[PDB]
Paper text:
Thyroid hormones T3 (tri-iodothyronine) and T4 (tetra-iodothyronine or thyroxine) are essential regulators of metabolism, development, and growth in all vertebrates and some invertebrates. T3 and T4 are formed from the precursor thyroglobulin (TG), a ~660-kDa homodimer specific to the follicular lumen of the thyroid gland. T3 is formed when the mono-iodinated phenolic ring of a donor tyrosine is transferred to a di-iodinated acceptor tyrosine; T4 is formed when the donor tyrosine phenolic ring is also di-iodinated. In addition to being the site of hormone formation, TG functions as a reservoir for thyroid hormone storage until it is trafficked back into the thyrocyte and degraded in the lysosome, liberating T3 and T4 for secretion into the bloodstream.
Here we report a ~3.3-Å cryo-EM structure of native bovine TG with nascent thyroid hormone present at the predicted hormonogenic site B. A cryo-EM reconstruction was obtained with a ~3.3 Å overall resolution and a ~2.8 Å local resolution over a substantial, presumably more rigid part of the complex, sufficient for building an atomic model. The structure is essentially identical to that of recombinant human TG6, including conservation of multiple glycosylation sites. Close agreement between the density map and the model confirms that the acceptor tyrosine is 3,5-di-iodinated (top), as required for thyroid hormone formation. The map for the transferred donor phenolic group appears ambiguous regarding iodination state (top), as might be expected if the map includes a mixture of donor mono- and di-iodination states (corresponding to nascent T3 and T4, respectively), heterogeneity in the orientation of the donor aromatic ring, or both. Tandem mass spectrometry analysis (LC-MS/MS) confirmed that there was a mixture of nascent T3 and T4 at position 2573 in the TG sample. At the predicted donor site (bottom), the map fits a dehyrdroalanine residue but does not appear to accommodate the original tyrosine aromatic side chain, whereas the map makes a good fit to other side chains of the loop containing the donor site (pale blue), including the aromatic side chain of the immediately adjacent residue F2439. The nascent thyroid hormone at hormonogenic site B is accompanied by a substantial alteration of neighboring structural elements as compared with pre-hormonogenic human TG6. The helix-loop-helix motif formed by residues 2515–2548 (dark gray-blue) is substantially reorganized, rotating F2539 (green) by ~80° and displacing it by ~9 Å from its initial position. This rearrangement moves the acceptor tyrosine (red) away from its close apposition to F2576 (gold), flips the residual donor site far away, and packs the double-ringed reaction product into an interior pocket bounded by α-helices.
Author numbering:
A (entry chain B): 1326 to 1330, 1364 to 1372, 1436 to 1453, 1458 to 1467
B (entry chain B): 2168 to 2528
C (entry chain B): 603 to 607, 613 to 637, 644 to 723
D (entry chain B): 898 to 909, 918 to 973, 983 to 1010, 1025 to 1060, 1065 to 1084
E (entry chain A): 31 to 105, 116 to 131, 137 to 257, 267 to 351, 362 to 380, 408 to 428, 434 to 505, 549 to 607, ...
F (entry chain B): 2649 to 2727
G (entry chain A): 2529 to 2549, 2553 to 2727
Amino acid sequence: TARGFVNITWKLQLRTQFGCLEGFGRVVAASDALGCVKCPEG
Amino acid sequence: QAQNCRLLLHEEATYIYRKPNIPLPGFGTSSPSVPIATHGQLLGRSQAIQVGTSWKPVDQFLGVPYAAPPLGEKRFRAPEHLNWTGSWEATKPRARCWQPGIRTPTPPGVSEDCLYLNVFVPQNMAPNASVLVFFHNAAEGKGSGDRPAVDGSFLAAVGNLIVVTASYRTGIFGFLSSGSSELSGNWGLLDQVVALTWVQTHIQAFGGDPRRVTLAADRGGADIASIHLVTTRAANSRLFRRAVLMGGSALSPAAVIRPERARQQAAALAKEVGCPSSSVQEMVSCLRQEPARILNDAQTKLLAVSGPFHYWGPVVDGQYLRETPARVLQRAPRVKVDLLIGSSQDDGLINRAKAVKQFEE
Amino acid sequence: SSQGCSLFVPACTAEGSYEEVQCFAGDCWCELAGSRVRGGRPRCPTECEKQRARMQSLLGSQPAGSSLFVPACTSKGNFLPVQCFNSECYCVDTEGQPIPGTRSALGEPK
Amino acid sequence: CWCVDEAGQKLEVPACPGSCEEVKLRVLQFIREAEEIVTYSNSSRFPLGESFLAAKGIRLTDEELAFPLEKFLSGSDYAIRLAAQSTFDFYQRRLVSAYLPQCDAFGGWEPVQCHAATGHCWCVDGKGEYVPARSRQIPQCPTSCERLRASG
Amino acid sequence: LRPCELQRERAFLKREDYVPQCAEDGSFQTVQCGKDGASCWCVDADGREVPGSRQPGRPAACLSFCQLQKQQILLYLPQCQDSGDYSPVQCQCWCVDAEGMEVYGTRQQGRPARCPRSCEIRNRRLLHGVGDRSPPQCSPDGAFRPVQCKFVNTTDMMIFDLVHSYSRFPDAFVTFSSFRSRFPEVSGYCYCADSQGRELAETGLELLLDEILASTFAETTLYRILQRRFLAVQLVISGRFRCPTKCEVERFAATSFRHPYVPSCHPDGEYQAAQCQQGGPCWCVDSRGQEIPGTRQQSCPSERRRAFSRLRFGPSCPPSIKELFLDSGIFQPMLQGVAPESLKEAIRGLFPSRELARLALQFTTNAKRLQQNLFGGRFLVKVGQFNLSGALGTRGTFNFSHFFQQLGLGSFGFEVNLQENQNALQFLSSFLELPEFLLFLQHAISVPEDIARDLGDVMEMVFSSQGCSLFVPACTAEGSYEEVQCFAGDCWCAGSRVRGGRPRCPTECEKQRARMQSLLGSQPAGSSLFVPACTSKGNFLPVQCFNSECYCVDTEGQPIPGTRSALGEPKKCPSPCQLQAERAFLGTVRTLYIPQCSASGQWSPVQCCWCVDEAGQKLEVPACPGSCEEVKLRVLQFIREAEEIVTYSNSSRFPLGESFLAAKGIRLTDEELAFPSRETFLEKFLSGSDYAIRLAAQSTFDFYQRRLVSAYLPQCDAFGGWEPVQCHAATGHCWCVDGKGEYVPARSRQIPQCPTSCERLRASGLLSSWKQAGVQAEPSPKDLFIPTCLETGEFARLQASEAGTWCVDPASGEGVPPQCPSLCEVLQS
Amino acid sequence: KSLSLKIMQYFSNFIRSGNPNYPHEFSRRAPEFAAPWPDFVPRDGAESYKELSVLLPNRQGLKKADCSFWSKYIQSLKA
Amino acid sequence: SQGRTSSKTAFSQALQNSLGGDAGVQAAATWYYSLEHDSDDXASFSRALEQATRDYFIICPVIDMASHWARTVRGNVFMYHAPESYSHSSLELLTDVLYAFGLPFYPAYEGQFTLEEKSLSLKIMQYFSNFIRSGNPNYPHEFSRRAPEFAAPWPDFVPRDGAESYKELSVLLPNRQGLKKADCSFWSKYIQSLKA
Ligand SMILES: *[C@@H]1O[C@H](CO)[C@@H](O[C@@H]2O[C@H](CO)[C@@H](O)[C@H](O)[C@H]2NC(C)=O)[C@H](O)[C@H]1NC(C)=O
Ligand SMILES: *[C@@H]1O[C@H](CO)[C@@H](O)[C@H](O)[C@H]1NC(C)=O
Ligand SMILES: *[C@@H]1O[C@H](CO)[C@@H](O)[C@H](O)[C@H]1NC(C)=O
Ligand SMILES: *[C@@H]1O[C@H](CO)[C@@H](O)[C@H](O)[C@H]1NC(C)=O
Ligand SMILES: *[C@@H]1O[C@H](CO)[C@@H](O)[C@H](O)[C@H]1NC(C)=O
Ligand SMILES: *[C@@H]1O[C@H](CO)[C@@H](O)[C@H](O)[C@H]1NC(C)=O
Ligand SMILES: *[C@@H]1O[C@H](CO)[C@@H](O)[C@H](O)[C@H]1NC(C)=O
């Protein structure tokens, strides 16, 4: 990080495979659209 | 297309609760029998107005008196509280004032008893709504007995405010002064400062707020209206917070007529109709007998700008107005009155006398 | 004939017949004044707009305080449904001609 | 027969679109026009000079060229968009988008409109007119009546 | 002081060959340096040097204190913010100051929602009883107010306690009259304070309180008056209505300590965009001073990108601030009566917060009276002429003696331009008693806080919009908004939009001409100043005169030494070719192309080799074409371009639509489309021009003619000279031209015969005696001759005149170096 | 009908707040229906007003030439 | 050079000398040209006073004479106006005498005049030579009405308010109409009436 930045991942909250914030959990949508609903009380 | 209202909030919130508006005693039905104190019920009517595709119900109290009908011996003297009682049928626009150049025979709905103010209050709105006392003398043609000349329901609805549309007597009837101690005055300016105390007192009965009145006035009658921005009231009871003068100002050349001009500007009238212009007491006591038709065929004759061009306006009388408006405006401000002043290019001293020329022809 | 009057080519309709809307280099005008619209296309003045402009120009001659008929046109250019002159309004057809009947006075729903 | 909008203007039983679907057929037609350009270029029966010359409003008539563009002659922003879509496509899809509104099943505008790609999901009234951002929780906005009721 | 300054001060006095550079906050700079920038080694807060760093130069962004303390533990872990500094709350989930040692009472199970700033701790730490009993004035965000003010008991010189006196006697502070009647022997004392609240050096200014409900005394009108006076006195001292900023304290300290890295800043106060350490690398820097992660060694491309998105959407300036401030005269009179800086900060010192300006503008109702209320009198005007020095000012810590010893009777490295400060302070005075100012506050208060944090930032964004469809800007390398933007035929460089052709940028000459013309409008009538004259293209005219003294000028309008003759006498001064020669000589030996000019001064035909026209402009041993051969090569190249277009289309290599985009100047770039000659073709159309239209028309005609199943090239003689009679070669209307292709005044019979270059010239010289020079150097009226033409048309070999005869070449009436050279003989050389 | 509905809001904001741009005297949210109505300041540099035309554009110097004749010259001639 | 320069007295004196030398005419001119004689800045007072003196002395009388020469017909009239040119001070000659006499072509002033100026001067020299020869700048011979080719025709000055044309001695040499209608209307009608 001292330079302004083994497995290194630079995940940006809003190559380059989309994901989502942990606790939401992605959807069958693989890689494109809308995805990663908020996980319900279940 | 459609009017889309929505609240303003200082910051997001989860639950938002709004308390519904409770109509004041009298409203809610389609005959809003408003009880105004020390008189009784003042029952008007309701009408639904369309602006976009959406309608707003607006209560309309057309023809609410604010002064005894200046007929007969109450002609060239200041107005006074009508002292009515019981139930007023404020559901039909009333007769409009006599104006220069009224086509003969006198058309329907023109008479000296023209001191009536229409009130247009939307159905239900905020507790302390604002008011707009628009001083407008309807023209000869506008108005069909069912509807007022300037409806004002449409400004009331798209502003959520009350719109009082007062009329007032103008011409000789309003302003036949003689600069002297016996007949000087601006009766039409004294009876449009009585349509503002009425709005001061009995507008709480409607949804209005006495502290937010807004004295407006149109072409030519905004030189008369703007004399309130320079007259000194008691200064404890202001009669308006703002002023929307459309087409005039206190500073115009003819905003007030000089006494020596006024004194002779009525001697011409008195001679013209046939009265003896020897002394005011004997002169005015003769005009008080002349029918309005004969007395308004005279002013239109004197008022044409190719011969005399006798314009009648607010004299200075010491009691109500004491100093010329140019000299009053030199003094320092005492109360901050906003102002939305303006004019139109279609205006013009010959356009306002349009009715007089058609009479001269 | 000299009255009035770079790399521009005019368009042509069938059998000569100078085409209405001539375009060039981002301009397009239908010449006649008040037609240059930079980008897009202009609309040829409808019959209404021609009568409006003529009557407006003729208005300048009339003495102040007097008025005459200046038909009002919609945004596209059609005559308004109702044309008033002086307290007497008549509903007009497409080319601004009064419809028989329907000549009520001003200030009453029609 | 055919069907027109409430102004009477021609609209290309012939039951035909609602508030939005017509606004969507325009976008569908637009992409169709853009693809028509790319395939004409691929077939190569038009010169570049023709496109430019039309851009300047100097199209050539087949009457003076008996040997054998309405999109471009009118130098309108729609033509600019169409040409830009055409050229972007050609290069992109030779070696190797347009916002069409989301609609409901009955042809009425869906309350919440999304750009479908890095979307800034605004929401529209019952006639597609936007009513007042890559934000989380793509906003929920009122249907046609929940807007009328909230106002009323 | 702090762990540093004690070490720092000691080194300076002792002269040890290293001074431990430490910034504001009295904390060691992460990257120290040696006595002469030889080897900058980076250290930690204690002052130890990291063993793995001694490199010469500047270490590449050495690790910050938080991590340099974090990784120590590994051989609780601090949570270092992205900037490398401690997070405000560590995590028992307590929170910490900006040094590492936790604030006292903050140990909690969960994260505190918000725990105090650097000031609120000092105030609370004052009630607990460690420090002099005078609470520092805290900014609402929690930081120290820039201008601290602590009263002083004039007797025995002990600070006047305020946590007690204000607590018990809060009414005494309602006004200055009340205060004096309760604590007569108190004389205020205002000073600037750094980020840590520590008193700055030699900036205290002991006011006088003799002649001039809230809480905390940091909101009472006493303070706000007592610091508006201090800032006013500072405007004279320093020139800016504010205390020295975080940058300037470091720069003054760096200049005073003469260490290698002296930070660079501009009177705005913010850190300069790029600070260049002397004796090593430079680098960009942010507002806080943190080096950008790598820059060791403007807004077009974003705007370009955004415009493209608006195209991608397919079919289907600040907000409301230009037409309330700039349109109406609520702003225009504000600047006129110095600098935006002195006007930016003259409304942070006044009205520190928007909730105050609202109060101020409702209790004044009188523009003239405003300056009386704010400063408790006519202070600042009394400050311009130094009437304060005896009235209010007093022995504090600024040494007005030394300040005046350089004057007639700077603070933090500020050069004192005393006349400008007196002008600037006066400017505020009239600006403050200005009726339009009250309206400005009424509007500046309204603007949403998100776009303007405070009234100071309100004012920039309205300065920034002083002037202020489907267009995409072009872009050069590294942003660099391109000079000439084209769209839909328009092309504008930015007061000149011209249709069609690509416009020309205003040369330096034209810019100077316009500036001096505008400055002429101010000058009184009958007086004049220098307005340099520019040629058609834009170059400076060879001779520039001012008044009876004319000096020939070089390329960029700089007088040449010598040649300063008086007006009205022939001045022969370097030809444009020789000026370009000297300019290129200087330019090309100053970086460590040569135009060589004919002896007469004109551009030599061959330049290098290659050949150019008489103006010296580049023209595509190489023999050069004649007057018409070049005009023919142009047409040949044009037909070649048209065929290139047709055979590009026949290759289906170019999208049908792109050629349209060029007409609208939206040629898109291959930086954003790296898939691909594509650019080369689009250069022809991009600048929508008559040439482009002609080329497109020719290409289309060719494509639709020769796909299934012209251009007038001029006729020329054997020597490249224009033929007298030019025919269109097909249904010809055979006009005839002069000796340089310029037409001189129909499918007629007997195609016209028109005179050669000399029969025309001889006929002219016979009819009207417009003779021709023989020597070209101020010929006497005898050196002139009427050309003698032999029969067929060419110039006679030998041309005579009353003064003598000379041999000329029959091609053109131009002499030759000498019997008499004949055509083939002159062509031999 | 659409221009009139932008001027019934300038004249209703004024009746309510005293400043046609803002409908509430305790909320300075800028207006969106039409362009801001600038306060009239008498300075000759710019004394803006509102041209009640279709676009509702602000202008300046209503009648500089003609109302300097009456206000400055003729008023002098009155003496 | 003599030392005495502008002062408070001069401001109200100069205006009086230049425009008066009357009391009502001065008020009218002071309003019309906004000559704030009290304002103590020669930079602006003088710049607004040169305009008044130019209108009164230099440019309206050369329109009054043109109109009176055309009306009570005394022969052709051709009016020209040479717009303000900021370039050539240090020549005590204005842009219509240093174009009508070929100042650009002088050997002394070589390199001081752009080729645009030299071409314009040549066109204007042709206009003035045509006038000197034939009496009508368009036609160089009084017995041949061939239209001029060098520049646009110079229209005869007819005093009708509908169109009273003149030639603007600028680079393009365009014809214009109504040289100074407002200001010379002021001076010729209002002030002249006010003289009585
Ligand atoms: C210089 O400052 C002195 C003292 O501050 C001024 O003297 C005061 O003047 C004001 C009004 O100008 C009076 O209200 C005070 O009573 C005066 N006080 C004293 C002690 O003299 C002085 O006016 C300022 N100006 C000059 C020119 O000296
Ligand atoms: C109204 O009635 C009251 C008595 O209640 C009386 O004193 C007053 O004079 C009356 N006003 C008029 C106009 O009669
Ligand atoms: C607002 O409304 C109530 C009645 O609903 C009125 O009594 C009150 O006085 C009004 N507000 C003020 C400040 O008067
Ligand atoms: C159309 O483009 C495609 C994609 O590059 C290409 O395969 C094909 O050859 C083109 N059409 C023809 C007839 O070449
Ligand atoms: C200031 O010093 C004197 C010294 O005797 C002290 O008594 C006095 O109380 C101090 N000032 C105040 C206001 O207390
Ligand atoms: C003020 O400046 C001079 C400059 O040398 C210094 O000697 C003197 O001690 C200073 N006076 C004070 C009170 O600091
Ligand atoms: C275009 O190409 C075809 C073959 O692909 C050829 O027969 C034709 O002559 C070419 N036309 C031109 C103008 O090059």
